[PDB]
Amino acid sequence: MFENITAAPADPILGLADLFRADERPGKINLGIGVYKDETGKTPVLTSVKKAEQYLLENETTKNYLGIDGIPEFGRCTQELLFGKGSALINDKRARTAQTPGGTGALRVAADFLAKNTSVKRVWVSNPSWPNHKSVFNSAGLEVREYAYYDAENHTLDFDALINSLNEAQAGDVVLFHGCCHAPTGIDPTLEQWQTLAQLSVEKGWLPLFDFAYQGFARGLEEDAEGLRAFAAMHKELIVASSYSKNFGLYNERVGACTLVAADSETVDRAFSQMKAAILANYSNPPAHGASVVATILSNDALRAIWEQELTDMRQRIQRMRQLFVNTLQEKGANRDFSFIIKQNGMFSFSGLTKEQVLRLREEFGVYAVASGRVNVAGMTPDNMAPLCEAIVAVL
Amino acid sequence: MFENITAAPADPILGLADLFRADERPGKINLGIGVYKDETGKTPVLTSVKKAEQYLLENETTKNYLGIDGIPEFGRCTQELLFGKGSALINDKRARTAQTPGGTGALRVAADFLAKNTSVKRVWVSNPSWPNHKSVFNSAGLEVREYAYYDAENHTLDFDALINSLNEAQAGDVVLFHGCCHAPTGIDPTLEQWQTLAQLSVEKGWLPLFDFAYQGFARGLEEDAEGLRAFAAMHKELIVASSYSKNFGLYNERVGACTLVAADSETVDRAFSQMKAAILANYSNPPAHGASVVATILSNDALRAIWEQELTDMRQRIQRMRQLFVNTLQEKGANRDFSFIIKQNGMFSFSGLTKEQVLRLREEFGVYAVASGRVNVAGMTPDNMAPLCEAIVAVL
């Protein structure tokens, strides 16, 4: 039966990686990475998760299955991170959390739950958004539509085009929002814009689905949850898919969570039972290890203190590389106005480079970036900054 | 939107567990467990996986994402376990393995791949089979049909009814087989019956899907792969979903594998690229920890020796409890012919008890079993055997 099966295309980032490893040039730089790197170009395992793992190794007596929704403490901890410690949502028990295999797993169980149990047929995603949002919802049988977001010219959130396009969504459609550090632009709504968006949302009957994968990378943990909290104070119902891959450096342990919120506990438990049915029809119950590590760190004052400090160090290194980039470009001299890079949040930004400019950056200089000009700032170190900027000036 | 969502029913085994924990009686026994227990009623983490985990903790430098299909060594090792070390399938490179979140995850990516990429519309599953086979295939949009398997009266594989029912399957239908230790009956095809089944299968054009979750529990690792190997020698194409949850005691780490086989390497790579597309649309890439442990044990002579011995100890404890059961029933005296228990493989068997008999076993004696009379032999210890058999004799 697999005789006339057509091949799936190569997925871009692991397309560039092969081209990069197959490059003999000495000062080659890969900016199309999708992961965080430190000054040495490594993606280390954090000291707090190493300490949490030594603890688990000494204390685990069984590898018996977790419940469908994973481990209770993990659920408690992501709800408090998401909604704040004294949240009404938590005290009225309007929210339930299922531990999933990463943020993508959270998005897929949400998609299956929605397609099986409600009448949602379309999901609105931003233009641009990073990337397999489409196949996750389309495999579940949901149509994905795009709303406008970025203004190429100004390197800004084109808010008018955003609400204008979003007004074609009907009541009962899902609208996907990035909680903070919008991938790939790094442009986030201001708190007032989040509030007007929340108000518009209830009036139109949109079901909000928040994709939260970079909490802690823009300003700080509570600050980054602010927009979601603007929506949760307004909405009877919402779904948030969060990831711990980037802020805990636990990429390959597949730790994420899907939180359901609705008007009261009675409807959260009934809706959640069907989300659990969706999980058993997929992977049955979630991988314990990455989640055990997150629950151990977040419930322990000492370990959490070390992790929070490790997260601000990541945030601050990203903020410094964004400054150093704009300044070394300024200094290497050409016609800069990369000042917008200073103003965007997270690891990603559109550099403003054309497809042909990234193409000769690769061929002539060994600087690797994706064809859209998207750049991961964590690929920049103080050491490679000046050859990087030299290359960019030479292709402008 | 979650306002008129109906609740999903309680899933039976975690229905009994609540009833069991809520039972105040001293000598209560739970035989409806689904997991292995040792003499002390514990599901321990094996010494070899503890040793492998200490190694990983000392040696891991990154938690960066694994590839879509997981870690290469894991793939190499399950293919050699499945097909034998000098298999033609391996040397002609006709098989590709993706590491998945457990055996259920393997079944679901197979289901999605099949429904998205081929014309299979129905999957034939045995009557009985254990349990959510149906929802995994039905969520993917595949129809599930049943073929006859067990003979209630004789406590045997009713082979005639099996091939007779299976002859309504059309060419291009998938037929699901349990590789060894058929859950829930413990009745397996004899090697000759596997061979006649393999021959019939190619002639009819069935696509075989093997569910292999108990390798090592019936007779030994190679011996249990024998039937699959009868089919692989006959077939150009097949899929095998295997689990390491039970034979490595790694239940909650979600380690399994989905192996694709087709006529040559060129079609395995094209078919496999679409299986990888199915994975990214679901959880993106697999949890490293459980699989790292399995790859570390299987590639290391010392650690593998310890694990193999730990697996035969599990196998042998199950074999002893099956003997002790038949004998203590014989000895407690009533009208036995539970001799078939000695002849079935794995942790499960149908005791032959009626729904009302299991109901009063629970109410009057605190012995908990599922309504079908299915019993997990690993719930029996030399200590609880005589109260167990006493209870069964009293309800006969």
Ligand SMILES: *Cc1c(COP(=O)(O)O)cnc(C)c1O
């Ligand atoms: C990283 C990311 C995800 C996926 O998180 P995983 O845990 O790696 O699956 C989802 N959405 C966005 C926007 C992300 O950046």
Ligand SMILES: *Cc1c(COP(=O)(O)O)cnc(C)c1O
């Ligand atoms: C245990 C089992 C599975 C599932 O294995 P997991 O790794 O726990 O998901 C699938 N099929 C059968 C017959 C099983 O016994």
